[model samples]
Target: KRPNFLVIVADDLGFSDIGAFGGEIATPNLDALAIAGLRLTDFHTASAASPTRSMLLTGTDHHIAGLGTVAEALTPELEGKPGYEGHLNERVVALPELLREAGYQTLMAGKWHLGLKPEQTPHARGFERSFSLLPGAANHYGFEPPYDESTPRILKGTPALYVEDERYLDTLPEGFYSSDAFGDKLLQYLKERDQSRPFFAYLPFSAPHWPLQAPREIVEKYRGRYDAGPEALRQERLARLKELGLVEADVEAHPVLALTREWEALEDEERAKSARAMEVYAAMVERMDWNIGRVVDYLRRQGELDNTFVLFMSDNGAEGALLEAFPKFGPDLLDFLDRHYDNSLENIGSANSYVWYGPRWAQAATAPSRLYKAFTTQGGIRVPALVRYPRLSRQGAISHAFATVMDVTPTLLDLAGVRHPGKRWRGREIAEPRGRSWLGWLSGETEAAHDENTVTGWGLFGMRAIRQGDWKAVYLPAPVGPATWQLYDLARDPGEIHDLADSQPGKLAELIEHWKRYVSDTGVVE
Candidate 1:
């Protein structure tokens, strides 16, 4: 029988948030995985939700994925544009679907921020069994609105249905943790697996993201933890990273987290309010780590602990600011943090309703990284990524090889000897696996792929960086206006300081050419 594949992806988890990755957060299970798996030091995400997930499932860049941006109920920026048109372009094939063709059972539980249309659900994508919350972030108690009576927005693909866990959920007055239930469902799926053909399971938790909702008890534990604010937290996390050897001693720390607020600066009432928000956000991470630990334990129990191939990562960096107006979910954002806000109840944050963790809390979450979400800094694209397969590899191995969310599909196919099984939708091809298989790297047979890697944020591609071995150059965009690219040599400075655009014109030209090629090859037109 083939071994099972378990992919546990965290939402908005910072590079330094998990213990496994030199983060202070309590994540023993993840730590254990790191101790026993391969740590890919150079894994990069799309810096956002839709893109990362798109690349993960279809092995295509976000430009080709159905929705390039977060496909939340709100967010007009991504509405009809790339990826938000409801169906993946056409050429794209989901890893799960291909796995199904490869004699493997596919399943997914938790968040599915890809598409909101009913037909675009996990089941429709490929999973034979799936339970998910279509929203990018739903209340732990399933408290968000738009639920048609019993339909709690939580979906199941086994019977191919969605039902509210009212009996267990309704009795709970407040503070229900969604990760708990999601983890339970994943565990149940593993328990019921036939142990016949190989199985592929995706468990994407909503914790550590938005709504910042968490159980009161857990939230309370983090009280006063942020009294010093983000600056302090960033400094502390930076020290921790150095101690753990995850960061270099001379790597410049981000100018004290661009958005952190001073604790003493906030008014008494303001401090109180900020404290609650921070608490909730911290609680979310706590719950996320807890659930992940439970899942890891389940793997251990099945004696499949080391045999199953597992990868863990965060979608993006910390984001502070409830920019939109949200009236759909009730108890909308504080309203003071408005700027192109989405304060709609439909989404905790958006043009209609906007709310965010604020720079300080986000700094606390991202730890040592500079800048929060939406910026092209290292924190924006850098996420915690660990790869492990008990049946095939050694433990405690770390690689500096560059990896990206897009590489997931190709990696899986290569590992399972599966091929691209495309999906048909919107009369266009949804995915074309652009990622190269890194199976050779996984086996420790190769150092890194010689192909160039370039990341594009939105349209202006202001902050572009390319890594050809230890020689990484970042080209910073005009910081005065919109987001732009800044060049930095990442090998010497992982913190991404010291602009090298003027310094290395030749490398700059080469990297930009690759970036442009990827855009053209992927047909990523904005």
Candidate 2:
């Protein structure tokens, strides 16, 4: 058989949350792959899940892939704008469609937040075999209803799993945890496929994301693990990263977000329960990795492991919000939650409870990077990426090349020895792909996919950022203070600690001009 491709995406995973990235989590399966393959130190994504996923599948800018802003985050200024239609639009084509036409079996499992409308489904887009969650985050367990039951329910309703070519509204299977079920579904799909054709499997697990739920046994294994608290974990992970040469020895770790409660300030019950929250989150990730191991074991047994091209990456950084605040149904719902699920440590990871580790743990998880999810900060977009392409990255090489999620589709086509259609495929015209293949860089034939002069832009929910070479400019919206263009030289300060807008006028103006061009070209007028 021709080489198979497996793109495994972790949802809302922090960059430093796994063993390969210097966190305390026991992700030996992931660590094994990183040791045998290539680790990407500077890979990035759109700051939010939907946009990153859209970019990953289409090899186009998120603005061109129908995800200018996530469906729930759209404002009046952005709603119904070009690329802001709240689904994966027809302008861009999906990777699976092209790959299937090129004689590969296309399969997908797990979260498909791009869209769920009749025309915007995974099957409609390109996937020949797909099991998906139509909306964004949901309860990890099968029995629980969505945390929110209001008009704009950000979380999908209970038992949310959609299968190939069919509309959702089905009950979830018994004994379901999202990670375990997702892995089992993909393995089943892989087994039922035509063996002669090479396969492209996209496993996007909604694990370690909020409403952080996990199996009780797994949760118990990590009890008291985070008793040291997030700040201590931050210092520890940063030190380990420095020792491992993953980060520069002298690079300063990003500080915790302002709202974090100091461990000393918290009452005894608060400290213990808050620590329990992180324990659940860690267990969720650990169990997800274990499930991935089951898939890898199956491939090994079938004699396909060596030829498989595995790419593992996180969609974005850790989610930092207090998700009890997520349900938008108002005070009655809040009172109801308080009455029904008080979020005690005993009930935290059960179907009845919904919680998040919040800013302190989120920042610790994103050690040495600024912010978590949503914002266009390093912590929001920077992710841990590992690629094991036997023909290209034959060793455990660590790459510092600045790569992005959009690069994956083109690279996949290149590795599969297919030509890009540019603006047309088969008989129909399609939107141009904005990404370049990273095969040359992965093989050490080149140092970068993009030239130093190339500029990259990002915009989501009024938060915007742009990068050209090492220079980056960020403009964050309100609630975190006034929106102003803050500048940073990433090469010198990857943590985005110092603002150089006042110190370097010419550079700031030049970068802003580049941002203007990007906004115009991508139709990000809002």
Candidate 3:
């Protein structure tokens, strides 16, 4: 029989926010798993949510998978393009759909940002049993009563859509919290699945995302932890990463963006609120870990832990956007927040409170790399990733492999001995997967999954980047960066502080050619 597969994805998680990475947060379960398995230190993902998820599920480029960019970020000119459908289109087959065809039980629980219509839900895509929040995010407490009529239309509307299997849900169970509820639903599905076949379980938790809320006890665990502020925390995590051999001792980390205010510049009350928000963020991470532990423990109790293949990864980098400060929506959003939310320092982690740890706290988690989510910088794309299975020659090992979210489905299918039907599925022609499988590398038969000649590219929200070996070229427009492209040698400057475009003009031009090819091949809309 094929091994059972469990892929757990954490939303908006940072690179060094787990103990297995360089974080100070308590994550005993993740640490143990990392120590007993293999850590893919250089794994990468899209800069945002749905695009990365589309690649993960389809084993194809996000454009080919029909999520060129997130639905919420689509522009008028880019809307309705072939690859800019803002949802998983019929151009590629989902991993679960293939697994279910191969006699495996497919179960899923958590966020599903692909589409909202009944025909576009998780059940429609592939999952045999699914309980999904059919949007990018939501209040973890579900749609509680006393609806605020003045709330922003985007926030008030999108988060309320939920589906179970083939039916849309009108109400949620009492005391519902995102992490716990997702874990509970997955466990229930596992217990109810047919015992005679292997299973594929996808648990994509929307924890640690915005509107940060957690149990008071959990939130209190990290009180005063971030009082020293973001700079102090960034230095601390960088030092720990060096000590753990995850980064070079001499690496020069990217400095904090100029937009971030110095901790000392804030008033006493402002500092307190900032620190409290970080505490809630940490609490959210720990709660997600606790729920992950529950699932792993359940597998062990069933005597199926050893035979299971588990992979844990973040969907993208830490979110640093100040939603209320966005260009067109800023004033209206701030007005809604001011009228409807209670983000007081004391009530920060309560059910009725709404808050987000801004770029200062986010950069602390993404230290040694530039920028945060929605940019093409290393901090936006690189994330924490680890894998564990029964057949590994090197335990407690770290692999500095250049892996991407698109590689996940290919690897899982390879491990399960499921052959992807090339070009067509269910009589419709589909795009072939662009991902390369890591089965040989994981089994100790190959030293690396990607060679130095391998090239990868990313483009989202007009920020673009291309990587080949240690060299990278990135472009960010206007206020954030010069409209022109900047180049870097990542082997020497992983933080991307030094620009090599001027000195290495030939290499820059060569990479520019590759970027053009990438755009053409992936159907990038401009």
Candidate 4:
């Protein structure tokens, strides 16, 4: 019999925010899985949601996988382009289709940002059973509309929820929370599955994303935990990470983000409010963990736990920037936030509020890595990944292999004894996967998958980076640094603190040339 695959993806989670990755949050379920299997310390994805998920599902570069850019942030010139179709294009095959053809039942729940339109939804993609939230981020309560009512503005005037291909426009049940609902719906799908064959379940939770809201009782658990603010918490987490050996013991601390407000500088009232925001964020994560435990417990009850391949990963990195208003809005930012939504301490995690945790706390969440999201920085792309497959994974092993989100689909297919059949599947001429399976490395047949000679290129939002061997070159927006590339030796400085671009101009030129090749080959316009 084929092994069942259970892939769980978390939205906007930081690298160090799980207990397995050195956070204080109660993620006993994730920690249990980590201890039972392997933890990947150097896994990367695109800096944001849709693109990374595209890479995740298709096992190809984001550009070729049909998410050249996220739907909300697409430019006019890029729209209607070949690769920038704003959804999973015909050139690539989604994981569900491949698995279904390979004789496995496919099921998915929670956040399907790949496409919002009916044709691009999960049902159209290949999921035999699916319950999806079509847009990027939404009110966890399932009632409140999106903050910006323009981009990704509800689907056909319906609420953001969907079940088996139909959108739900009316009010949610009284106690409908996203994490809880996702878990329940997925469980229902699992119970209704055809037990004759193994299944593939993709649970992508939109927890811990923006509009950081959670239940009152859960939020109260971490009430004053973040009162000391980001700097202190960052230092504390950095220490814990080193102790956990997740980071190098002597690794230098990353420089603080450019425009973050100091914790000590905030007024008494401001500090209290900030503390509540972080508390709610933590509560959201913790609640997701509890819901995950429910699924695991059910699998155990069904006697399907041991033979299953379970993989847990964060979609990208933590979201840091506070949205007073994005680009163009009629009303002032904070005023709109205060007017349309609640900013009160008591209402911080309730459905009435629409808020973000902002920069400083994001610093703590992404400790030991620079920047938060929407950049080519380590913190923006690097995230925590844990795999628990009793047959293939080593117990309690930590792998520092250089892997990307593109590698996931290929790896899963390998475990299922399936191949891409080259240029065609079911007579469709599809683009081949750009990713390589790490099954050998994970099974201890090899030391690592991609080594020093491996080269990876990244580009999004005008932020560009290329890493070859131990050297990485970063090009950020103006005023953040020199407009030209800044280089760092990642082996020695994983935090990317020092610059080596001036010293190694020859190698830097070579990598830039490599990046140009990637851009051309991937057809990445930006």
Highest lDDT scorer: 3
Give the least accurate 10-residue stretch of model 3, judged by summed lDDT: 143-152
| Model 2: per-residue Cα lDDT over 1-526, one tens digit each | 4689999999999988889788888898999998788888889999889999999999989998888888876769888788898899877889888898889888888899988776788888788888888778777776554355442344433236565556565677778788988898899988898877789998999998887888889899998888988888888889888877789998977667756568889999899888888999999999999989988888889888788999999998888875545545544444555665558878888887877788888888787998888878898889999998677743687778888998999999988887778777666667777778988877878878876787899887678899998899999877763599999999999899999999998999999999998898888855
Off by over 4 Å in 3: 143-150, 153-157
Q: Clashing pairs in model 2? A: none
- Winner on lDDT between 1 and 2 is 2
Stretches off by above 4 angstroms in model 2 are 146-152, 155-161, 167-169, 324-333, 426-428
Clashing residue pair totals per candidate (backbone < 3 A): 70, 0, 0, 0
Q: lDDT by residue for model 4 over 327-398, one digit each (tens)?
A: 433445565456567778778998878778887788787777888888788889988998898887455877
* Residue lDDT tens for model 3, 198-273: 8999999998988888889998889899999988999999999888888889999898884657899999999999
On the 0 to 100 scale, the lDDT of residue 175 in model 1 is: 37
Residue 94, model 3: lDDT of 94
Candidate 1, TM-score vs. the true structure?
Answer: 0.82
lDDT of 1 by residue, 1-526 (tens): 4567889888887777777666655577778777688776677776566667777887776666665444443246546665445445455767786788778878777877666455577777778777776655554554433333332222111111232221112243233356887787877887888765667889898777765666667766766776665566667777887777777677776554443347777777666666666656666777777887787787787677666789888876666533432243432234332432333322332213324566666665554455656555666677778887865543577666677777787877877876564555436545556567777766657666434443433321334444554455444455422344456677776666566777887877776666676656655544
Q: What overall lDDT goes with each candidate model?
A: 0.63, 0.83, 0.87, 0.83
